[model samples]
Target chain A: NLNVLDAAFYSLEQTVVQISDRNWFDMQPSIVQDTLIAGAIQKFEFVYELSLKMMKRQLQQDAINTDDIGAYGFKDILREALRFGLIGDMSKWVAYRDMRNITSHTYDQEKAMAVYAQIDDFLIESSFLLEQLRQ
Target chain B: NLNVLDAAFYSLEQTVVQISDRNWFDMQPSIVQDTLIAGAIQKFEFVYELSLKMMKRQLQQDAINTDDIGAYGFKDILREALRFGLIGDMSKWVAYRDMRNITSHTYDQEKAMAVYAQIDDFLIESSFLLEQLRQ
Candidate 1:
């Protein structure tokens, strides 16, 4: 199960990269192709969210064997993730959470543009988190 | 929108290939690593499934607008696909459907092994169907 999950995870990251890498046009704004950009951002949002869920599951399996860690919500997950060395930067995950929420608000140009500016960073941090989950 | 779908379709194919292309062995029977093989097969099955669904939607908007085409059942979908020139072999689609059923029945060793032997062929024919849909 983990093996295929690993493979599936890899596919999502690469696909998100493939999508996000293209359709990244800022100049002449409307040419940016909002639909394609939305698809790419949606994939990024899903992949990151899925990775975190997997983290919570592994928390019980390979992470700390305590009710506190096992019963954690997202905020506590990040903190325990750091304690378990699953992450180096705690703030990054919170940033990802903020950015991910903007997916629903992409209709708002300002909110969408703000998140778009940081997608490259989102992808980078997501990669680190996924690798940790694999371990 | 087309660009993102195109990119997504490409990624699914590559992933099916990526997973199927790994851990392939015919030497020792047990060395086949059933869990990993099952994982890869599951991905292939799903990617193939997704491509067909995208094809169905694309078909209504682009392929054929007949009420007849839109009324296709699961089996009817492939039959319509054949009429649309979206696939070359009809029997192969049936085989894939059968194989997909086995994903839920992996507990049966004989059934699992039989599907495993046929997976690579499923991957190839699935790619063919997907490319045709892309058109």
Candidate 2:
């Protein structure tokens, strides 16, 4: 539901805001900075997952033949979402997935930093997706 | 490595404590309350993932035959952790994995609430795992 997706977005918004604020992020002890980054990434993970779900739901509703919608894999759904103009820059979403894959390598600091750097684009792309989803 | 794990625990600890506090939790706007619950679950997800990685790392350190260590699968690592006394109950970790699985269903509010209810146990169990890892 959008409500649940919105809640996840709200949570993600707060964490990203805190971490993006240079003064705010720098004021923290090193570990706290790291924690905030991890927190942001966690929120990002959910937003990405839910965004896909929302996209799938939208695709399912719009498809004349809904038979294959249920079995659509990750890229398959994204491909459809792109075809339907539900997302911009399909490769960015792919990058988000790649970043999320790094997360499955589990919390390596350097890996987290690499993923963290990409969240800015994800935030904008995902926010766009959410707004598109809202309409 | 412990530092990263400890940081995750610290973040999880604060989130769970606040959500567990009835007065504080009840005072939030309904959406805020939901956000807190989601936040806690996000942290729980990370802590659980990191805990598993830490377990695998510890198992690797102690294994006599390191040849197969890197290839060990999820349950293989958990069974080894149990054998090494790194975790108290095999079933509880399995339960945690089950809870994490619900998360993969992607932000169903009911599923989030059910998983939120499970984090208290996870927090305790993960804390125990973290301490064991420290030793």
Candidate 3:
């Protein structure tokens, strides 16, 4: 249901606000302990979850085409976003989608950091999109 | 002089250490205040300076056909490092070089952040490299 997607989106929005509020000096101690890093980690987790849920709903609604592999189903939405100027480029979406794949399926720390770093970009873009959507 | 290059390298190394030690909580606050964000900003500045100094020194010394156009000159060393397994891939070097261009030449914050985020990756790689080089 869209409710799940909405909940995940709200969590993502909150995480971004929290992350944007803390100063690096304030962050250093918690980062060393690992618990403080949860906000950053949670941000990516929310994106991955929202993306998965949205794609699942899309596939179910259009049952005539049953190829439900992750990310592929969302390409059309991404293309439309680009076409409508909601997104300036598809590369960002593609990168975000790929990073989602790694975050959802892998246990590698290096890989996870790479994905985490990209999640920062997605957060920036999503914030812009949300503001536009509200209007 | 090696002093200039050493100073730049030291600055870069220190930036990496400082960034690693700080939490995103601390960073987020500074990120907002702008002044607090200097640590992250300075980190990239040091890297750009160090890279430029090192490459310039390399060129000045017996430099053979002088086509010093920034980053292009580093390809040989990158290849050597990869050949000896010091680096896992040349692609990282290429990406770093391109980011350095955007950081050094552009005033775009979006581009800078893209570079900033990759600096996180570079920081990770550099830490490993430093430990190995020290041994």
Best by lDDT: 2
Correct interface contacts retained, every candidate: 0.00, 0.06, 0.00
Which residues of candidate 2, in runs, are more than 4 Å off? Answer: A1-43, A54-80, A102-124, A127-135
TM-score of each: 0.43, 0.70, 0.35
How well is each residue in A35-129 modelled by candidate 3, as lDDT tens digits?
22223443455555555455455444545554643346567766655554455656777777776555422222354356555656777665554
As for candidate 1, its interface RMSD to one decimal place is: 13.0
Evaluating just chain A, the predictions reach TM-scores of 0.74, 0.89, 0.56
* Candidate 1 structure quality by residue, lDDT tens digits, A14-41: 5445444443333313412343344345
Q: What's model 3's lDDT at A47?
A: 51
Instruction: Please report how far candidate 2 places residue B105 from its true position, in Å.
Output: 3.7
Binned by DockQ into CAPRI classes (incorrect, acceptable, medium, high), candidate 1 is incorrect
Which scores higher on TM-score, 1 or 3? 1
Clash-forming residue pairs, model 1: none
lDDT of 3 by residue, B70-120 (tens): 444577766544544545656766777676555422222354356556666
The predicted structure with the larger TM-score, 1 or 2, is 2
Q: What are the per-residue Cα lDDT tens digits for candidate 2 across B64-119?
A: 97678568577777788899999999899989888888776444568778888787
lDDT of model 2, residue B126:
89
